[PDB]
Write an enzyme that holds these catalytic residues in place. Structure first.
Site, short mmCIF file in Angstrom:
data_model
loop_
_atom_site.label_atom_id
_atom_site.label_comp_id
_atom_site.label_asym_id
_atom_site.label_seq_id
_atom_site.Cartn_x
_atom_site.Cartn_y
_atom_site.Cartn_z
N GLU A 94 14.87 37.93 -82.24
CA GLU A 94 14.99 38.02 -80.81
C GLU A 94 14.95 36.66 -80.10
O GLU A 94 15.79 36.40 -79.21
CB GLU A 94 13.91 38.98 -80.19
CG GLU A 94 14.13 40.45 -80.48
CD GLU A 94 15.27 41.12 -79.79
OE1 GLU A 94 15.90 40.54 -78.88
OE2 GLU A 94 15.55 42.28 -80.18
N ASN A 96 22.00 38.86 -68.86
CA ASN A 96 23.00 39.93 -69.14
C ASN A 96 23.89 40.27 -67.93
O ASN A 96 23.62 39.87 -66.77
CB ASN A 96 22.27 41.18 -69.64
CG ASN A 96 21.29 40.87 -70.74
OD1 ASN A 96 21.68 40.43 -71.82
ND2 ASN A 96 20.02 41.08 -70.49
N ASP A 147 24.49 43.15 -66.22
CA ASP A 147 23.88 43.99 -65.16
C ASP A 147 22.92 43.24 -64.26
O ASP A 147 22.20 43.85 -63.46
CB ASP A 147 23.14 45.20 -65.77
CG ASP A 147 22.05 44.79 -66.78
OD1 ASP A 147 21.88 43.57 -67.03
OD2 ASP A 147 21.38 45.71 -67.34
N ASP A 151 16.47 39.02 -70.37
CA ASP A 151 15.47 39.26 -71.39
C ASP A 151 14.53 38.09 -71.50
O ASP A 151 14.98 36.96 -71.50
CB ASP A 151 16.17 39.48 -72.73
CG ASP A 151 17.15 40.63 -72.67
OD1 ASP A 151 16.75 41.74 -72.32
OD2 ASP A 151 18.38 40.39 -72.95
#
Length: 129
Positions: free
Chosen positions: A35, A46, A48, A52
């Site tokens: 990750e 991202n 939208d 993260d």
């Protein structure tokens, strides 16, 4: 903070992740590797408008508040900035909530990709804990 593999293993062990909801410690260390590369300051944007955050790349649409993600549900009840801190206490608390949400560790795509169905014990090989 960029943790080493064994430093992170020990921290996650201390914070109660080993066998949390049946997921042995190596799962969590592996997930973190893929990750974030063990980096609490990792961020990824991202389409939208979500981002993260942190060592387990916790998403701002669903889990934390970053003040700039539309339709955020902040289900961990934390500012995403707390996930950038060196101390992973708050990240671990959120990760535990995520993994209670119903999908287990499937919540982490890097875990699905590289950890699921492998010998995750290799991720704690050599570590004192």
């Amino acid at each position: 903070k960029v943790y080493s593999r064994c430093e992170l293993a020990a921290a996650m062990k201390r914070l109660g992740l080993d066998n949390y909801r049946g997921y042995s410690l190596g799962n969590w260390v592996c997930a973190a590797n893929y990750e974030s590369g063990f980096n609490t300051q990792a961020t990824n944007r991202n389409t939208d408008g979500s981002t993260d955050y942190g060592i387990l790349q916790i998403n701002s649409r669903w889990w934390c508040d970053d003040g700039k993600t539309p339709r955020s549900k902040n289900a961990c009840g934390i500012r995403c900035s707390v996930l950038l801190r060196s101390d992973i206490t708050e990240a671990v608390r959120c990760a535990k909530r995520i993994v209670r949400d119903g999908n287990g560790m499937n919540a982490w795509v890097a875990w699905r990709n590289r950890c699921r169905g492998t010998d995750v014990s290799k991720w704690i090989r050599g570590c004192r804990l």
